[PDB]
Amino acid sequence: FEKGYQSQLYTEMVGINNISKQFILKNPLDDNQTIKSKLERFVSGYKMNPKIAEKYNVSVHFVNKEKPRAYSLVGVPKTGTGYTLSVWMNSVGDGYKCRDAASARAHLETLSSDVGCEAF
């Protein structure tokens, strides 16, 4: 069950990524400060399937505020719910299923024992 929920989260995040890329990143003339806050408003205000929104928070992250087109999305369970499985992904399209929220916030790419993420 929680695995099914992590799948739908994955699929929602892909949906969010695709709209971000095609409607926000694609704007020809917005400056990097504008792209960055638009990404942040859009992502943080987006309403996932209510089954999923009840259980997960989705956020967008930047290494470099001057390269906002390089961002990742982190999907993690709401605090205190007993859920652990998480997701993260690239603006470039590489996505990951993670065994815990920490590994999603760390954008890990492989598993080790039962910690980390795998390419999906």
Helix (H) or strand (E) holding 33: helix 32-45
8-30 CB burial, b ≥16 within 10 A, e <16: ebbebbbebbeebeeebbeeeee
Cα–Cα distance for residue pair 117/111, rounded to 1 Å: 5
Q: How many domains does the chain have?
A: 1
User: Would you call 73 helix, strand, or coil by DSSP?
Assistant: strand
Its domain, for residue 97, covers: 1-120
Under 8 Å between Cβ of 1 and 80: no
Q: Which residue has the tokens 């969010």?
A: 16
- Both tokens of 41, joined, read 């408003």
Stated in angstroms to one decimal place, the resolution of this structure is 2.4
User: Would you call 119 helix, strand, or coil by DSSP?
Assistant: strand
CATH number, position 24? 3.30.540.20
